[PDB]
Symmetry: C3
Subunit: 175 residues, 3 copies
C-alpha cells in the first residue's frame, strides 16, 4: 500500500484497522485520518504543505485529489461524501456535506455543514457557503436551501459508504 | 493484475484474449466486457451496485471512472470512444458515440447513437439526447445534427483505437 | 517504474536523475523531458502519435493527462506549472505559464508565455492566448493582462516545485 512518509511526517490514523484503503490509494505526509474513513482507487492526499484532515465516517471516492498551499489547511468535517474525481485544495468542509463528482473547491473556500455541491461545480477561492445550501454552476451559485429530508440522504450516503468500505476489506479478492 | 472480484461477481469477458487492459487499469465486480474493447491507463470500472456493460470495439481512455447507483445500470453501446478522464455514472449510451475528455454523464441520462459529446460537457440526470446529436456546454445543449462525415469519423475513431490497443499488447515494453 | 517504450521510441531525458518521477507516474513513447521536470502521482504521458515535449523546470502535477492526435505535437515551454488533474491535448504552451488544476487545453491551442489559466478552464481547439494573459472560464475568456508581481509568482511557483521535487526524491519513504 502506498502510504508514504515525507519530511518526517506520516499519515496518522485514529483507527487504522477501521479504514478502507484501496491498493491504488496514496496518503502522504501530514494526513490526519478519522474513524471508518475510506479511500478509494487512485485517490491522492499530498500532505506536504499545510496538513490534510479527514473527519470520521468520511468517504473519499475514486481519484480525488487533496492538496494545500501554505496558509491554507484542508479540513473535512465528519461523515462527508467526496464524489468520484473531486479536487479539494486548501479549503474547509463542514460536517455531513457532499462534494459532487468532478467538483473543484479552491483555497480559502468555506463550505457549511449539510451542504450539497452539485457535480462539476467550481467553488472559487474564498467563496463562503451557508449551512444547508444546494450549490450548482460555473460560476457556483446558491440555488436554494435543502429540506430536512435532503439533509438525511447526506447522512445515509456516509453510512452506506462506511459499510461498503468494510465489505471491500473483507470481500474483494483478485479474480 | 488489477482485475478484482467482489461479493461473488468477477469481470466477464466475451473474448478476453482480444481485450487490451493497461496494467494499472482496474476492473471490479459485475463488469461485462465485449470484444476488442480497450481499457487504458488508470481507468476504473467499479461494478459493485448495478452492472457495467461495455459494448464491443469500445475504447475507455485514461482514468475514466464508471460507477452505478441502484436502479441505474450502466450500458455502453459498441464502437464508442470514451475520452480521457470522462465520468460515466449509471447511464445508457448509443453505439458509435464519442464522449469527450473530461465530460460527465450522470444517472439515468440517455445518449443516442452517433453522438458527439464535447469535452468538459455535463449531461445532467435523466437527460435525453437524440441520435446524431452534437452536444456541448455545462449545462449541456444539443447544438445541431451531424453530417454523414462526422458520424463516419466516429466510426474511424473506434476502429483506430482497436488497432492502437492491440499494438500496445505487443509493442509496449519497459525502457 | 512505469516508464515505457512504445514502437521503438523511448522517453529521452536531457538530464535524468534531475527528474522527479512518482512511482505511479507513466511515461510512454515519444516523450522529451527537460531538466528538473517533475512528474507527480498518477500522471500519464502517452506519446504514441505526435511527440510530447516537456520544457525544463516544469512541474506536472497529480494525474495530469497528456496526449496527441497526428498533426498536433504537444510542447510545453520552460518553467511551467501544470496544475492537478489538467488535460493537455496536442497544444503548445509558452514558457512560465500556469495551467490551473482541472483545466482542459485542446488540439492546436497556443498559450502564450507568462500566462495564468485558472482552474476549471476549457481552452478550445486552436484558441490563441496572448502573452501575459489571465484566462478563466468554460468557454475560456481572456480577462486582462497580468502585472509583473503576478508574473513573478509564476516564476516562483516553478522554482518551488523544482526544490519540492528533489526533496521528494530524498525525503519520501513508505509507512
Ligand atoms: Zn496544489
Ligand atoms: Zn458513484
Ligand atoms: Zn487523446
Amino acid at each position: 500500500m502506498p502510504i508514504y512518509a515525507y519530511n518526517g511526517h506520516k499519515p496518522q490514523f485514529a483507527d487504522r484497522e477501521s479504514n478502507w484503503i484501496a491498493p491504488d490509494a496514496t496518503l502522504i505526509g501530514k494526513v490526519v485520518v478519522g474513524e471508518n474513513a475510506g479511500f478509494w482507487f487512485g485517490a491522492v492526499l499530498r500532505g506536504d504543505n499545510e496538513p490534510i484532515t479527514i473527519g470520521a465516517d468520511t468517504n473519499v471516492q475514486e481519484q480525488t485529489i487533496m492538496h494545500t498551499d501554505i496558509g491554507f489547511p484542508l479540513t473535512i468535517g465528519a461523515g462527508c461524501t467526496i464524489g468520484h474525481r473531486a479536487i479539494l485544495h486548501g479549503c474547509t468542509i463542514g460536517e455531513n456535506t457532499l462534494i459532487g463528482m468532478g467538483a473543484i473547491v479552491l483555497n480559502g473556500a468555506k463550505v457549511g455543514k449539510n451542504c450539497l455541491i452539485g457535480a462539476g461545480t467550481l467553488v472559487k477561492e474564498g467563496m463562503e457557503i451557508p449551512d444547508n445550501s444546494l450549490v450548482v454552476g460555473s460560476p457556483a451559485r446558491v440555488l436554494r436551501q435543502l429540506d430536512d429530508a435532503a439533509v438525511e440522504k447526506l447522512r445515509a450516503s456516509a453510512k452506506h459508504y462506511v459499510e461498503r468500505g468494510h465489505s471491500f476489506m473483507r470481500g474483494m479478492e483478485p479474480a
